[PDB]
Design a protein around this ligand. Structure first.
Ligand SMILES: NC(=O)c1ccc[n+]([C@@H]2O[C@H](COP(=O)([O-])OP(=O)(O)OC[C@H]3O[C@@H](n4cnc5c(N)ncnc54)[C@H](O)[C@@H]3O)[C@@H](O)[C@H]2O)c1
Ligand SMILES: NC(=O)c1ccc[n+]([C@@H]2O[C@H](COP(=O)([O-])OP(=O)(O)OC[C@H]3O[C@@H](n4cnc5c(N)ncnc54)[C@H](O)[C@@H]3O)[C@@H](O)[C@H]2O)c1
Ligand SMILES: NC(=O)c1ccc[n+]([C@@H]2O[C@H](COP(=O)([O-])OP(=O)(O)OC[C@H]3O[C@@H](n4cnc5c(N)ncnc54)[C@H](O)[C@@H]3O)[C@@H](O)[C@H]2O)c1
Ligand SMILES: NC(=O)c1ccc[n+]([C@@H]2O[C@H](COP(=O)([O-])OP(=O)(O)OC[C@H]3O[C@@H](n4cnc5c(N)ncnc54)[C@H](O)[C@@H]3O)[C@@H](O)[C@H]2O)c1
Ligand SMILES: Oc1cc(Cl)ccc1Oc1ccc(Cl)cc1Cl
Ligand SMILES: Oc1cc(Cl)ccc1Oc1ccc(Cl)cc1Cl
Ligand SMILES: Oc1cc(Cl)ccc1Oc1ccc(Cl)cc1Cl
Ligand SMILES: Oc1cc(Cl)ccc1Oc1ccc(Cl)cc1Cl
Lengths: 253, 246, 246, 253
């Protein structure tokens, strides 16, 4: 028997097989979880991608900017898992920031519409997804979104850092809401995962700072962590952040 | 001599004489600073308010959602303080969240359009004001914005809390940029001011919500040369409350 | 199959069946783990308590102030689980502060001798237990100690709070060392357990002080292979309370 | 007129002219502060050291392990500043950890008696000094101790890191006590100050991470910060930590 046996879990954020949500999905199904999956735009592609998953799973469309997608999302899931059934888990692995706000572009050159669009997608959508889905979730359930420690500024990450700080603050509020349904809300703050010279420097220090090391080619440790929060072995943790970063954020040098 | 003697400081955010920015300006002027002041919509009203300060100061219009007010800010400021002169301090004391994402409204019912507008005015504008004014600031200078500790979730504050968390993240990126200019960037996270009961109890030294002067003082401390090694950071002017659980 | 199936786990700190360590052990045994258990002074009494667990387990004496109990611990553990075998988990659920530095006594009136003894038993022993048992642990293993969030000051807890702050600092240094062994080291910061009212109110999911099982579960989660990328860290088993201000 | 005019301030922790407390003393006197100074053992040396200070100041003996020194400390200060006078400021710049617990020695090889002695001197003494001195302090007053950010483990620092975490937790409690007298208690978390290859790496990254840079040969920025807290321009901050580290702790890379 597996970690997530009989639990019905919605996973968003699969675009390729390198996506963190592919591995979360992969590992959740390995542990006996019944998935519903959502995707944004390139649906034809992600049909073939999610076929490379261990088990079959209905695939729905969900642009988190789209207001019709959100209002219909409860009924579409319910149809997909069968009326009378409910979700025990929800995975948010969605994030986007335009290259105007992340990377080489100077922090001060990002226009607000672009920053606004990235904050919409990477932080606010955690609330509106929880809002869509909370009415069709069982007590004991668990919502989990993906994070990248924003405690300190770093190069490149720029406005995506700022989006992740907003996400964290959003997580604490969603938990207030989720808790009235007896449902937990947490973030997994992951280390860098391989989905210019400066960026190599960060990733390098990550493995060096990590007391147990950090392999950027391996997404499984993060998938596992998420399934831990989706399981029942972490039942008194909510509003919170769990770090799957090799322990790097706990070490200065 | 005064704490800010001979320093030129931009003070944004006066709308009333209850405004934190008003007391900051008042104290900065009490301590010898030369101010330039900015105002949003009600210019005539705050002209009447800004006439209540100890000393006179130029009043520029600044709506931080307005791209033309931003790209022209440097030039307008220069004209006020005189060419060749640069600012030594900038006060961001601007916030706004529509009532749809702050108050009695449930946290899930705030439209993005409204939360995006609040985050624009409360967070992103700390960066775009720095962007504008950094070219016209002196080495050793200081940019300070107003904060309310968002490390934990709380009733009512809702998406403004989310705004403040973003500001804190922005402040750390603004100090990256500011440092290229020899300039500092810090936040004062202040207790609740009457522009709560738990706040005063928790505060080891106590907390008066009817007094903004202790907060104004902490801002001025940051605008001076007595905290020259702190940037990207947050000074808590809160009676100590956030250091205490109960 | 069980969560800890086939894993050998040291559980320290049982003195009663109200002890957090008792429920941890009970749950680890419910989930298929093989235990070795340690006890301080009252060995016969906890023999009687440890007979109340689902499955039987060897009971070693361990006073962490005793240097001879430490240097002999590895050898004694090996003898219990059989040579060639190594532990996969270690539970530090030991704390003590004399009443002179925890309770009604004022914070300034605790002698150092008493605070030093409490910090010895509550903090430094997390390191010396790791020091002892690291040589006899398998790669992929996990060391977990018990914590109570000390990030803010609070009445009564006093110098035990200071102990817990030191533990947290020690845990981060223990994970440095543990990592050389492919082993993890983390703290569970738990809510108040009946071995407060504010705690349940703040907890978004609620907090039952009469139930230690949700905390025991979180410990077991850390002893398993489902959090393999977390070390030097703190998991809060507190109903979410510490994420909420009011 | 200066920052600290008419304020009577006790400064501990001068052993040489490179000490952070020499500069705190130096800068406090420059700003019109009336000092009382304490020292540990080598009193003859620190008499000549403190002569190189701008202004004269009574010099008392204070071993913070010594229980007689502490119980007599209020009366000795009072004699030194004149009966009826009181202290407006107190500076704790004391720290020690034996080399068994700090540097090359493996973390696990430090014996508790040594760690216990370093924790006594670097953390517990902040309480017992506040205890000695609080009865002879004016409302509006300020106690300030020296800190080195312990949020994360780093090499070398080892058990001194642990001592500083204890200090921080102690600061939050002293503020509870100090507040009944209307006196603030804060820490200045300073960057590294020049008072093997690995240690050079830390100091280097400090200046690199510091958005405004960090000069390890210059103690004045830290002295200034302390005088800020000793002044009246930070009157609603207590139980707290101020970082004079160039902004380095706010930056990952
Ligand atoms: N990649 C890393 O190093 C790592 C580390 C920490 C955190 N994270 C976070 O994990 C999450 C997924 O990361 P990833 O590396 O797997 O990225 P990915 O590019 O593989 O996946 C991101 C997903 O966001 C989806 N998306 C974008 N806009 C959307 C919209 N408008 N509506 C619905 N979906 C939308 C995309 O379709 C995509 O599947 C992100 O939130 C990311 O910030 C990743
Ligand atoms: N009052 C409190 O308890 C408290 C506590 C902590 C932090 N703060 C912060 O202090 C700052 C000022 O708050 P205050 O209490 O003086 O409130 P206030 O209402 O008096 O000031 C807010 C100011 O922001 C200005 N503003 C709004 N939209 C603007 C725009 N688009 N462009 C330019 N200016 C705009 C307003 O005109 C006003 O002067 C804010 O950042 C607020 O978040 C307040
Ligand atoms: N009860 C709570 O609300 C709570 C909350 C958070 C954290 N904790 C932590 O959980 C851990 C265990 O607490 P508990 O509530 O089960 O209390 P408990 O009194 O049942 O357990 C404390 C244990 O420490 C042992 N101990 C004391 N001195 C020792 C020594 N010198 N050598 C070896 N063992 C020694 C005792 O024998 C006892 O079994 C402690 O670390 C405590 O700080 C407790
Ligand atoms: N040096 C740095 O890079 C730096 C950075 C951060 C924090 N700090 C802290 O600042 C403080 C002073 O540091 P420094 O670099 O000036 O060191 P320093 O060696 O020059 O001064 C340390 C002082 O502690 C005193 N002392 C030791 N044991 C004592 C005792 N038993 N009783 C009374 N006094 C005793 C010594 O006499 C000495 O004057 C320390 O707490 C240190 O940890 C220093
Ligand atoms: O958060 C992240 C952190 C890292 Cl180190 C790498 C990738 C991350 O995730 C993203 C960043 C930007 C955009 Cl547009 C989309 C995604 Cl999915
Ligand atoms: O941050 C704040 C904290 C508190 Cl206790 C009270 C008011 C605050 O600030 C605001 C809240 C909403 C809007 Cl529309 C404008 C401002 Cl200035
Ligand atoms: O950490 C704790 C937190 C709480 Cl709410 C209650 C008890 C705790 O733990 C202790 C306190 C004092 C002693 Cl002598 C022994 C232990 Cl185990
Ligand atoms: O805290 C410190 C931090 C740094 Cl980077 C350098 C020195 C420090 O201070 C000390 C460390 C050990 C001992 Cl025995 C005495 C003192 Cl004064």
């Amino acid at each position: 028997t597996g970690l997530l046996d009989g639990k019905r879990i919605l996973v968003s954020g699969i675009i390729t097989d390198s996506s963190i949500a592919f591995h979360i999905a992969r590992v959740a199904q390995e542990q006996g979880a019944q998935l519903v999956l959502t995707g944004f735009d390139r649906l034809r592609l992600i049909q073939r991608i999610t076929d490379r998953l261990p088990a079959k799973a209905p695939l729905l469309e969900l642009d988190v900017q789209n207001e019709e997608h959100l209002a219909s999302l409860a009924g579409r899931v319910t149809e997909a898992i069968g009326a009378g059934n409910k979700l025990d888990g929800v995975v948010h692995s969605i994030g986007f920031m335009p290259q105007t706000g992340m990377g080489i572009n100077p922090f001060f050159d990002a226009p607000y519409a672009d920053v606004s669009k990235g904050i919409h997608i990477s932080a606010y959508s955690y609330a509106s997804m929880a809002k869509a889905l909370l009415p069709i979730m069982n007590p004991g359930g668990s919502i989990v979104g993906m994070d990248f420690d924003p405690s300190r500024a770093m190069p490149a990450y720029n406005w995506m850092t700022v989006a992740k700080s907003a996400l964290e603050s959003v997580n604490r509020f969603v938990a207030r809401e989720a808790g009235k349904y007896g449902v937990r809300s947490n973030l997994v703050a992951a280390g860098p995962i391989r989905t210019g010279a400066q960026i190599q420097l960060l990733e390098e220090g990550w493995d060096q700072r990590a007391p147990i090391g950090w392999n950027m080619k391996d997404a499984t440790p993060v998938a596992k962590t998420v399934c831990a929060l989706l399981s029942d072995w972490l039942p008194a943790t909510t509003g919170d952040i769990i770090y799957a970063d090799g322990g790097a954020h706990t070490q200065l040098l």
